[PDB]
Amino acid sequence: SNRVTVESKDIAAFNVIRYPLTTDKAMKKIEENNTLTFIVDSRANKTEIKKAMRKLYQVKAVKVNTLIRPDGLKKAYIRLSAAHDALDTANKIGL
Amino acid sequence: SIKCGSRRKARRAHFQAPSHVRRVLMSAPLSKELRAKYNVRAMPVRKDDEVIVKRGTFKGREGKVTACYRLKWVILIDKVNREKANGSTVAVGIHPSNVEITKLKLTHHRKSILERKDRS
């Protein structure tokens, strides 16, 4: 192998998901739609976002909706399974 | 060796000097007692040094160095200050070559510097 750098498997999830959003739309989605909102990697897809959510916050994402914002950042609308409460995991996150 | 034949180059080397060259440039003379006991004529000023202003308006003012700004080419002294329009107290900057070091803040590295400097 011509690549000799040490790349670990325990960090990819931290790169896939950057930070949650605190805006009013995000708060409404948390309260009503059981949905969390994160800024994610712009090269990431929905499958790896689901895996990152599972590995980071120990919740199941039934649906992930993504958009690339007009400022270049990709947003993620992540609805959790009914067995997980978005408000509880949001408090656990610190949002 | 900032000074050279070309004044343009000497001024450029002085005013674009890095931080450590600026430290060397901002040296102050030691007192006669310190010159007697260390056989050194001048040292770069340092925080917590005790200095006395020899030149300028604040001549005779004595205090402890609180800051060596090195970006404004000045040292801030606790006893040297003035009030603003608000009445709050602000530190007046003094060029280190206008002051005199009366007590040194001594550390092992500065002791090694003094041993490097002494003429004996």
Partner: protein
């Protein structure tokens, strides 16, 4: 917080990876705090944690590269050395003749050199 470089150098690869994981977790939490306001004292910890991550990764990569350069030192492996582990120098310097190849002489040239060596002499 801050990780000492000597402490990182004494640690093992698995412990290094674990420390990297915990620091990445801390940096993620600090990014969250940076989004939701947060105390300036907390936000002052971001740069130390990023530099500690950089220090851990530097130790990991230096150890890996030294170990791999050791592994390919043997002539049985040295022909299969990855390009990234070989010496860089310059493209022309890599393709240029080495001193050993440059100094090659014919048997006639060597015999001439031995038979008529250059002398050291002086004139009064």
């Amino acid at each position: 917080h801050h990780m000492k470089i000597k402490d990182l150098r004494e640690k093992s690869k698995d412990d290094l990876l674990k420390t990297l994981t915990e620091y990445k977790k801390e940096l993620s939490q600090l990014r969250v705090v940076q989004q939701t306001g947060g105390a300036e004292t907390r936000l002052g910890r971001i740069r130390p944690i990023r530099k500690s991550i950089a220090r851990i990764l530097t130790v990991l990569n230096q150890n890996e590269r030294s170990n791999l350069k050791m592994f390919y030192a043997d002539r049985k492996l040295r022909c299969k050395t990855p390009k990234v582990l070989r010496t860089k120098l310059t493209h022309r310097r890599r393709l240029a003749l080495k001193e050993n190849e440059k100094n090659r002489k014919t048997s006639r040239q060597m015999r001439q050199a031995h038979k008529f060596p250059k002398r050291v002499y002086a004139v009064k």
